[PDB]
Design an enzyme around this catalytic site. Structure first.
Site, short mmCIF file in Angstrom:
data_model
loop_
_atom_site.label_atom_id
_atom_site.label_comp_id
_atom_site.label_asym_id
_atom_site.label_seq_id
_atom_site.Cartn_x
_atom_site.Cartn_y
_atom_site.Cartn_z
N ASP A 154 -16.64 -0.50 1.62
CA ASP A 154 -15.90 0.77 1.56
C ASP A 154 -16.52 1.72 0.55
O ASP A 154 -15.82 2.47 -0.13
CB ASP A 154 -14.43 0.56 1.22
CG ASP A 154 -13.53 1.67 1.76
OD1 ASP A 154 -13.95 2.44 2.67
OD2 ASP A 154 -12.39 1.77 1.28
N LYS A 156 -17.86 4.94 -0.89
CA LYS A 156 -17.66 6.36 -0.63
C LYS A 156 -17.24 7.00 -1.95
O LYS A 156 -16.77 6.30 -2.85
CB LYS A 156 -16.60 6.59 0.46
CG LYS A 156 -15.22 6.04 0.11
CD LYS A 156 -14.28 6.16 1.28
CE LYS A 156 -12.92 5.58 0.95
NZ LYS A 156 -11.96 5.85 2.05
N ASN A 159 -13.92 6.20 -3.84
CA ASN A 159 -13.67 4.89 -4.41
C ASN A 159 -14.43 4.64 -5.70
O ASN A 159 -14.43 3.52 -6.20
CB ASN A 159 -14.02 3.80 -3.40
CG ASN A 159 -12.95 3.65 -2.33
OD1 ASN A 159 -11.87 4.24 -2.43
ND2 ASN A 159 -13.23 2.84 -1.32
N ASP A 172 -10.68 -0.19 -5.20
CA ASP A 172 -10.25 -0.44 -3.83
C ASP A 172 -11.15 -1.49 -3.20
O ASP A 172 -12.25 -1.19 -2.73
CB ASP A 172 -10.22 0.85 -2.99
CG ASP A 172 -9.49 0.67 -1.66
OD1 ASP A 172 -9.34 -0.48 -1.19
OD2 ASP A 172 -9.07 1.70 -1.07
N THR A 189 -15.13 3.95 6.54
CA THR A 189 -14.93 5.36 6.77
C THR A 189 -16.04 5.88 7.67
O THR A 189 -17.20 5.52 7.47
CB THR A 189 -14.93 6.12 5.43
OG1 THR A 189 -13.97 5.51 4.55
CG2 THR A 189 -14.58 7.59 5.61
#
Ligand SMILES: NC(=O)c1ccc(C(F)(F)F)cc1
EC number: 2.7.11.11
Length: 338
Positions: A154, A156, A159, A172, A189
């Protein structure tokens, strides 16, 4: 040998906690609720203050019934089991966890500087030295996570929190997973998905290195390399093998990005025989002192402005909703191990 023995100890310490996870180390009425910092389809994160110690924390609250409906049971179990077992300078630390009749709770260190996303959007784009400082921390963090057979999945700007020293703290772990070999879940995402995720293949840690290429591009350009209004159009661009670079990108940056944004996972930097060293030894990182970064001895590109441990000014405003705890236990069996 230096790196080998470091990662050997890291894995030893992870596995001990992995095999005997901590459970039920606080309870909800030990905390005061201050402010909602973020909110999603099955959970939210709130600033809380411990009533006895006075310490602030970010409390992630997951609604058990929504987790079940949205098919995130294994994922929420992954997140807590991994977070209670890891330990690295650039990972937000888990301080407590517990559950009640309605919710799962993960109480982690509060990072008042806010998300990299906010700062990147405020300034437009980061200089290459600035992007490189953050990128080096992600490289070391992935080197650590991958050696533990963990994939993060994840990456990005939202985060990556910026702490009081201007360093990254990754938050996260909702999609993080311990994986030997391959895994198959569609998650992430759209802008950051590797081609092999889009094409429903069995994939591995190479998807993290792809996502690092997306992140570095977005930090240095101010927008991600594959952009569109519909996810389907984003996906067409990701699988195409074509990426355009802004003219202000250095030649070294473009070369590194071509090798991270390699659609053939068997040729992608970070997934070759030399592993992470193809990235660490790339010309774009020639000025990076990897040990100095790990030791937090490098002066940061900027320090977030905030007034104290309880300042929320770097996060945005959300409707304040109840933390309702049902009189009856929900989904007890599904979350037994939490
Ligand atoms: N550990 C933290 O300080 C933290 C702060 C905010 C969030 C957000 F997702 F709500 F933005 C997540 C984590």
């Amino acid at each position: 040998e230096s790196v080998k023995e470091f990662l050997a100890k890291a894995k030893e310490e992870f596995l001990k906690k992995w095999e005997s996870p901590s459970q039920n180390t606080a309870q909800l009425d030990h905390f005061d609720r201050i402010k909602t910092l973020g909110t999603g389809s099955f959970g939210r994160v709130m600033l809380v203050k411990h009533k006895e110690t006075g310490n602030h924390y970010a409390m992630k609250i997951l609604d058990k019934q929504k987790v079940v409906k949205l098919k995130q049971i294994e994922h929420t179990l992954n997140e807590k089991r991994i977070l209670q077992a890891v330990n690295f300078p650039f990972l937000v630390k888990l301080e407590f966890s517990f559950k009640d009749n309605s919710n799962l709770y993960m109480v982690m260190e509060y990072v008042p500087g806010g998300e990299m996303f906010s700062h990147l959007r405020r300034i437009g784009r980061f200089s290459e030295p600035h992007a490189r400082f953050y990128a080096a921390q992600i490289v070391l963090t992935f080197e650590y996570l991958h050696s533990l057979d963990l994939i993060y999945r994840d990456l990005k700007p939202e985060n990556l929190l910026i702490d009081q020293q201007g360093y990254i703290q990754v938050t996260d772990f909702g999609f993080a997973k311990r994986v030997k070999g391959r895994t198959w879940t569609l998650c992430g995402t759209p802008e950051y998905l590797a081609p092999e995720i889009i094409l429903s293949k069995g994939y591995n840690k190479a998807v993290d290195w792809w996502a690092l290429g997306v992140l570095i591009y977005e930090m240095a350009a101010g927008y991600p390399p594959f952009f569109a209004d519909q996810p389907i159009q984003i996906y067409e661009k990701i699988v195409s093998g074509k990426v355009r670079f802004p003219s202000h990108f250095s030649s070294d940056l473009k070369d590194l990005l071509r090798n991270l944004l390699q659609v053939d996972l068997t040729k992608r930097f970070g997934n070759l025989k030399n592993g992470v060293n193809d990235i660490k030894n790339h010309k774009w990182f020639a000025t990076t002192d990897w040990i100095a970064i790990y030791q937090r001895k490098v002066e940061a590109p900027f320090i977030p402005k905030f007034k104290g441990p309880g300042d929320t000014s770097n996060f945005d405003d959300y409707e304040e909703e109840e933390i309702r705890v049902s009189i009856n236990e929900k989904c007890g069996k599904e979350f037994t191990e939490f």
